[PDB]
Paper text:
Members of the plant-specific Catharanthus roseus receptor kinase 1-like (CrRLK1L) family are key players in monitoring the cell-wall status and regulating cell expansion. CrRLK1L family members localize to the plasma membrane and are composed of a cytoplasmic kinase domain, a single transmembrane helix and a variable ligand-binding ectodomain.
We obtained crystals for all receptors and diffraction-quality crystals for [name] and ANX2. We determined the structure of [name] via single isomorphous replacement using a platinum derivative. The structures of [name] and ANX2 were refined to 1.48 and 1.1 Å resolution, respectively, with residues 26–411 in [name] and 28–411 in ANX2 being well defined in electron density. In the case of [name] the crystals from both studies were isomorphous (r.m.s.d. of 0.6 Å over 382 corresponding Cα atoms) and grew in similar conditions, with our crystals diffracting to higher resolution (1.48 Å). As CrRLK1Ls have been speculated to bind cell-wall components, we mapped the known carbohydrate-binding sites onto the [name] structure. We next explored other potential carbohydrate-binding surfaces: Structural alignment of the bacterial CBM22 (DALI Z-score 8.6) with [name] mal-N brings the xylotetraose ligand of CBM22 into close proximity to the distal face of the β-sandwich domain normally used by B-type CBMs for the recognition of carbo­hydrate polymers. We thus tested the binding of [name] to various cell-wall-derived carbohydrates of different natures and lengths. We located three and four well defined N-glycans in our high-resolution [name] and ANX2 structures, respectively.
Author numbering:
A (entry chain B): 26 to 410
B (entry chain A): 26 to 411
């Protein structure tokens, strides 16, 4: 059927602020008796009125049927703008969303979730494994616990993507590995480390992912030192698919800085709020654009205080890639529960004292955090405040 | 083993006018020698320079090896743009193409085929039955009969597809069928009847098939009346796979029109140039979007002057589907013989008088014509020049 950007509750085509074209959802909606509504407040923080200002509202289970290619992986995005739609209190909305037998959301309150994030809108993004079916059935089910619950949706995107997931190294364990090839994933965070926001229009692979500056997630007292590649520095992908990440991710990084003695005394630390009781994959993106040789910059990486790369196998970007300007990533997996970090993921970097490196520093170019499904479920609870 | 769109002779990723992404063919070329070439001339009829303006040229045999799932059916497309490449005379190009054990093309002249069609480029499309092999070997062999014979290719696509083929009713016989489930097929024609061209980007199943307007193929004096479903009319597929055809096929149709007297005195007639000595499957796509009951519109269907639906079993779309808005298709098979049939398939419809229907009309929403393989061969001769 091909990729779609549906603005729910619209009757004509529309375009957003980033030159993405959207179309009405009506075509794809199997079930009747939905309500369409336009919000009566346009939050000044919205980047566009599209798709956010218009919604479709469901008071019974409702299914969209989107033609897809069965053998392919897809990105699915759900856009929500909890605002005022004439005649409803958005606080009453609690619902489930499923996509071909994968549960995405359950008892989901967009209002509570937005309040907790201090953001007026939400985009939930998922990477769905191939389901061998030529229709993606997206079912919205109002809560059967609350008589007054309704479901709503402002936009849906379905985007074919390559098989960009394979194995991840298990954090804190010696050489253990797990397969992500058939996993369903939720995108939790996607950062351009040390660099400016990259809008979807500048993403690679036609995937229109947004990559956010990482500064708001730095937990260490030190912000470190951001690095920028020289003008027209060439990112040499070699055999890495360009869809993994756009070149600009690799042209900037965050490092600890030029003072190796100070760097040895601290970790550069990021912290993220996530849902308990899931395995997460952290994809760390690297590209050395300053140094040229093995054993110049060699560093330990820790996830939730456990070893990701350390001891006699620390991280060395040139050690991994063989050459300045080659991009790469490494995937690490951690099951996060009460004993392992609770509701938080921490990522920490510090120089290694193995093999007498030329410098004592660390760096990172990009970061993605994905939730893996457990028994075809990705739904977590709503956040607190 | 993913789907591929290879633009042969390129060294950078490219994209065409319909946003299809293409990549270089280099990694998949397994045996032989070849060079990249760029066409000297951009024909104004080309929608894109991708993949058509670049080619790989073979002066001896060469093979691609493409990873596939052996238990799955595939679409294979071969793109050709005859032009002057590396100083060679395109009129000397005659070659064979094989995909595993299936001969697709033999003594193939892209130049002559293009001249006969009044088209500057060709896309040959095949549906290959499961191979039980994890590699698709695509072999290009220059003709060993002409001395300066060479082969060329501009683009290759390999696309995993569902099993969209089963049995077809043999025309002019009753309860005799042809089995296409494990056949290798060539796509000859694919039409949105009564509607505008549907580009591959809008095709269902992610199969990127183009559905072309049918008007050029009508040979009755009357072109009938084209119909379009109302705004927000929904096509209700039920258990028919959406990969069969996109919704827009079913939202338009060609009919004979509102004058039943005129309709009763004529056939709506399509004609197609094909290759003799093959069995063809005609897939007729239907969806009733105006009427609502059985025995409102009831019509006879003839293929090569023989009965496909007639007598006491004429076509009735609601009769078949049970409801307005439910799409369907019916497959019919016909052998086109070396004398009778004579390089053409004709499809004709006219109203039936059987059972006193409310109206006297006929309609059709889409049409596909497939060649079935014989002796593991789908190759036909080059058409006559004019
Ligand atoms: C296509 O098939 C014909 C044979 O067709 C069969 O035999 C015929 C004699 C007739 O009985 C048909 O109805 C049968 O289906 C191949 O042979 C040619 O056939 C034509 C007449 O149809 C005849 O004029 C030629 O002399 C025959 N040729 C030879 C070499 O004997 C023909 O070669 C086949 N073509 C292809 C491209 O495979
Ligand atoms: C950098 O962070 C790592 C990981 O959190 C620190 O190592 C941990 O230190 C605590 C003690 O404070 C121990 O309980 C853990 O066992 C350590 N983990 C590992 C994997 O060794 C490390 O000390 C920090 N370094 C600095 C300089 O702050
Ligand atoms: C559905 O979601 C809300 C989450 O916000 C749940 O209600 C909250 O539950 C927690 C206790 O875990 C309290 O701290 C909050 O005060 C509750 N908030 C509100 C607004 O009621 C609710 O329990 C969930 N329901 C189900 C069936 O899971
Ligand atoms: C519509 O076309 C059909 C099929 O070509 C016509 O039926 C044929 O008529 C010719 C001449 O009368 C015969 O040689 C064929 O044997 C007929 N075939 C069949 C299957 O009946 C039919 O006459 C045409 N209808 C109209 C209304 O013109
Ligand atoms: C290969 O194809 C060419 C072109 O179709 C064939 O040559 C034509 O043969 C027919 C006779 O069947 C004549 O009508 C044309 O004048 C010929 N055209 C040219 C350009 O020569 C040729 O016979 C075929 N060769 C083989 C071995 O099958
Ligand atoms: C997490 O898992 C533990 C252990 O299975 C369980 O006791 C707890 O209820 C779960 N908590 C959440 C928030 O899912
Ligand atoms: Ca909307
Ligand atoms: Ca960066
Ligand atoms: Ca090409
Ligand atoms: Ca049509």
């Amino acid at each position: 059927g091909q990729d779609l950007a549906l603005s729910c509750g619209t009757s004509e085509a529309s375009a957003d602020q980033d030159k993405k074209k959207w179309e009405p959802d009506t075509k794809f909606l199997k079930t009747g008796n939905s309500i369409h509504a336009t919000a009566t407040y346009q939050d000044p923080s919205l980047l566009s009125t599209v798709p956010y200002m218009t919604a479709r509202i469901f008071t019974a289970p409702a299914t969209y049927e989107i033609p897809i290619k069965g053998d392919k992986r897809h990105l699915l995005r759900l856009y929500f703008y909890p605002s005022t739609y004439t005649g409803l209190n958005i606080s009453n909305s609690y619902f489930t969303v499923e996509a071909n037998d994968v549960t995405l959301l359950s008892n989901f309150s967009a209002a509570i979730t937005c309040q907790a994030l201090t953001q007026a809108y939400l985009v939930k993004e998922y990477s769905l494994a191939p389901t061998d079916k030529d229709v993606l059935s997206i079912k919205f089910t109002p809560s059967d616990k609350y008589r007054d619950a309704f479901a709503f949706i402002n936009g849906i995107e379905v985007i074919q993507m390559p098989e960009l997931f394979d194995t991840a190294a298990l954090v804190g364990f010696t050489d253990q590995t797990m397969d992500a090839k058939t996993a369903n994933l939720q995108s939790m965070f996607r950062l351009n480390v040390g660099g400016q926001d990259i809008p979807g229009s500048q993403d690679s692979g036609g995937l229109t992912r947004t990559w956010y500056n990482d500064a708001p997630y730095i937990f260490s007292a030190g912000l470190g030192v951001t690095l920028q590649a020289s003008n027209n520095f060439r990112i040499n992908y070699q055999n890495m698919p360009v869809s993994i990440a756009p070149a600009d991710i690799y042209k900037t990084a965050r490092s600890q800085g030029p003072n190796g003695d100070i760097n040895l005394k601290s970790n550069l630390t990021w912290m993220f709020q996530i849902d308990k009781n899931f395995t997460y994959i952290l994809r760390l993106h690297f590209c050395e654009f300053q140094l040229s040789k093995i054993n110049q910059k060699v560093f330990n990486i820790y996830i939730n205080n456990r070893t990701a790369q350390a001891d006699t196998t620390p991280a060395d970007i040139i050690g991994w890639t063989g050459e300045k300007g080659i991009p790469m990533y490494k995937d690490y997996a951690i099951y996060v529960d009460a004993n392992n970090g609770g509701e938080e993921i921490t990522l920490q970097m510090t120089p290694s004292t193995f093999g007498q490196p030329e410098y004592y520093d660390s760096s990172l170019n990009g970061l993605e955090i994905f939730k893996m499904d457990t028994m075809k479920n990705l739904a977590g609870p709503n956040p607190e405040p």
